[PDB]
Enzyme design. Sequence first.
Site, PDB file in Angstrom:
ATOM      1  N   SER A  85       0.802  -1.176   0.000  1.00 54.05           N
ATOM      2  CA  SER A  85       0.000   0.000   0.000  1.00 54.05           C
ATOM      3  C   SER A  85       0.854   1.251   0.000  1.00 54.05           C
ATOM      4  CB  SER A  85      -0.910  -0.034   1.236  1.00 54.05           C
ATOM      5  OG  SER A  85      -1.693  -1.181   1.284  1.00 54.05           O
TER       6      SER A  85
HETATM    7  B1  LIG Z   1      -1.293  -2.409   1.939  1.00 53.66           B
HETATM    8  O1  LIG Z   1      -0.539  -3.226   0.960  1.00 53.66           O
HETATM    9  O2  LIG Z   1      -0.404  -2.040   3.042  1.00 53.66           O
HETATM   10  C1  LIG Z   1      -2.714  -2.979   2.278  1.00 53.66           C
HETATM   11  C2  LIG Z   1      -3.382  -2.158   3.336  1.00 53.66           C
HETATM   12  C3  LIG Z   1      -4.852  -2.149   3.078  1.00 53.66           C
HETATM   13  C4  LIG Z   1      -5.574  -2.880   4.135  1.00 53.66           C
HETATM   14  C5  LIG Z   1      -6.451  -1.907   4.844  1.00 53.66           C
HETATM   15  C6  LIG Z   1      -7.681  -2.565   5.386  1.00 53.66           C
HETATM   16  C7  LIG Z   1      -8.357  -1.853   6.554  1.00 53.66           C
HETATM   17  C8  LIG Z   1      -8.298  -2.722   7.797  1.00 53.66           C
HETATM   18  C9  LIG Z   1      -9.551  -3.454   8.202  1.00 53.66           C
HETATM   19  C10 LIG Z   1      -9.295  -4.458   9.305  1.00 53.66           C
HETATM   20  C11 LIG Z   1     -10.562  -4.968   9.944  1.00 53.66           C
HETATM   21  C12 LIG Z   1     -10.345  -6.152  10.830  1.00 53.66           C
HETATM   22  C13 LIG Z   1     -11.639  -6.745  11.316  1.00 53.66           C
END
Ligand SMILES: *[B]([O])([O])[C][C][C][C][C][C][C][C][C][C][C][C][C]
Lengths: 548, 165
Positions: free
Chosen positions: A1
């Site tokens: 990300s």
């Molecule tokens: B990246 O490659 O660093 C990906 C990051 C995106 C993921 C973000 C998702 C938001 C988190 C939700 C977690 C909920 C847990 C129940």
Amino acid sequence: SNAIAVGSERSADGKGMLLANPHFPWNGAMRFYQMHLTIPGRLDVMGASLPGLPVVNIGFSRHLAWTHTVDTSSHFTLYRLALDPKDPRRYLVDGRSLPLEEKSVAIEVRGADGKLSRVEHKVYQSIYGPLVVWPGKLDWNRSEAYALRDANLENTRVLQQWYSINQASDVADLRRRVEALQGIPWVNTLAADEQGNALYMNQSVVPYLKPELIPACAIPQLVAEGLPALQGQDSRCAWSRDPAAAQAGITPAAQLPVLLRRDFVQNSNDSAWLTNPASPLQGFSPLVSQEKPIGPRARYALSRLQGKQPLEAKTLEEMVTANHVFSADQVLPDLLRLCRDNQGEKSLARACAALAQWDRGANLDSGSGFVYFQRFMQRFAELDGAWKEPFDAQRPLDTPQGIALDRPQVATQVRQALADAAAEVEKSGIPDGARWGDLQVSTRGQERIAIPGGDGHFGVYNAIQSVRKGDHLEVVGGTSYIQLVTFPEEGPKARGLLAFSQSSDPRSPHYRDQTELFSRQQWQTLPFSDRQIDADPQLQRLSIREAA
Amino acid sequence: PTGLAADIRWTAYGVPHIRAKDERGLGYGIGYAYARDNACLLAEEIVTARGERARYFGSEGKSSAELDNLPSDIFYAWLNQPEALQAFWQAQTPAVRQLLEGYAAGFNRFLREADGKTTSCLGQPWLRAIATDDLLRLTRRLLVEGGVGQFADALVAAAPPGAEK
Ligand SMILES: *[B]([O])([O])[C][C][C][C][C][C][C][C][C][C][C][C][C]
């Protein structure tokens, strides 16, 4: 990300701006989905979420936009157990022998006959959590075993946390709401608001150990490799308690990195350290943030962000859509010089030509030079001392750089690395003429769609991960939900796409519509206001109800 | 009167805009809209988080996280034990409980009406009405992705030594 938040001091309009570019799977339980939620009068938020969750995970509202990136903080610790010399199912804490707990689970398994059989399996547990085995590294022998304590198992606040974020008004309110609840499990948070604040928070659930405990409680061999491992035979190595923490044993919010600025903050999965180099974040627990060399995506972003020129929405969009392979900036010039020093080395001829003609991109029409470069880099990665300028902590943005060609051993190994890479490339089934878009695709039913972008490890901001399948590279993850938000007077203007489209079902009208758009890199309006929504000629409405 | 009601608008590319007067109605709209696009995905991932992959698909298959079915099932049966799910539910605010109750009801409403227009797994035994516990299972699966989830295979592999030298 990637995430970039820009504030009043750098945005062309003097207001806030946010680019959200999470890199996540294109299928399965982490597949993003777009939605807009409104409870008139008190909730109005739009963005994207993970399957099963009735909240917006990355999104924007009237005055605020936020996003997340996976952080470098530890969210668990391993504990090395000292086993009872008389019984390997018992372990010692302060010299006292404790029994492991056993919990059996039973699973039904459909057999070849089509009938179910029951399989029982014992899970051994310590006071810290379940035991874990990595053969050859974390074994369970008669001397030691390893247990794992996961800090998020007691985080019951996670859904509440995003629901609260969905209700946040501006950056200050967002910060209060996240710090108060501490329900974010394993991501950073970056945000911008209309008034022009840019916020970075490394505010997640992280095991807390008071600083004076760390030298003696760490397992030196394992933390050197970046495993959060502690001495499980000493009761003093239990996670520390602090009444200010929202959950027993986690790090209080005041001890986690936050940067609030009016110029910019960014993150591309490195630690908090160089979120903005003008104000380095240092002095944190090694479980939280360390000063490690940044990856090429962040180095790329900082190369575009630093300075005094205003940043436009278009600037941030094009940081994604340029598909620039930033790792080439460090090695390609010297590599091409090696090529020129070696004409008549017939084994290098095709590789050298392809590299020379290459546009240094991962665009649909980028040439095979990208493929040669990738295979060379995989081998360059593993050579010893081949950088001309290795990482310099005093110049963390500009090093490493170059190939140490004036060292005869390096020149020899680099040439061989290129020869081997060229050989590998040419014994793959890649045609003549073929461009990157002919190779990397996303399959949709009986058809394919060409996908631009390349692996984040090569410094492509638009990170795309793919795996070899038959005659092609199949996209499995990467750029997913894209949102770019600004705040003109009318209301928030959001622009972006969901790369893999709303529906995972081949039968849906929304199985490949945005994927065709992603291929051509044509981002679209994300309609938020009633006026924007009503202006859509594709608008459809359904009201549903049923008894409780 | 009661109970659950939502107004849904879809704009280009099938993006839903859900309006409701409370969390329960909001969840209703989300669950229904998501089901229209992704019922099969959610059903598959719920099978995973319930630790039932081997029951439906046998031992030779894998989950979408690329874990073998049996080790995956052992891990999720361990993670999502009844006592863990109930403790988790009991710690939820009324608002979150209502969001989840609505979501389950909305997803289920779509399943009742589905004729295959946007659902390829129609008729599969694993495509079934869901419960709030199923959403808790998915939530907890995501919760531990930064922790014990990355050690699922290693947990399943942990057995004490035998008589070896
Ligand atoms: B990246 O490659 O660093 C990906 C990051 C995106 C993921 C973000 C998702 C938001 C988190 C939700 C977690 C909920 C847990 C129940």
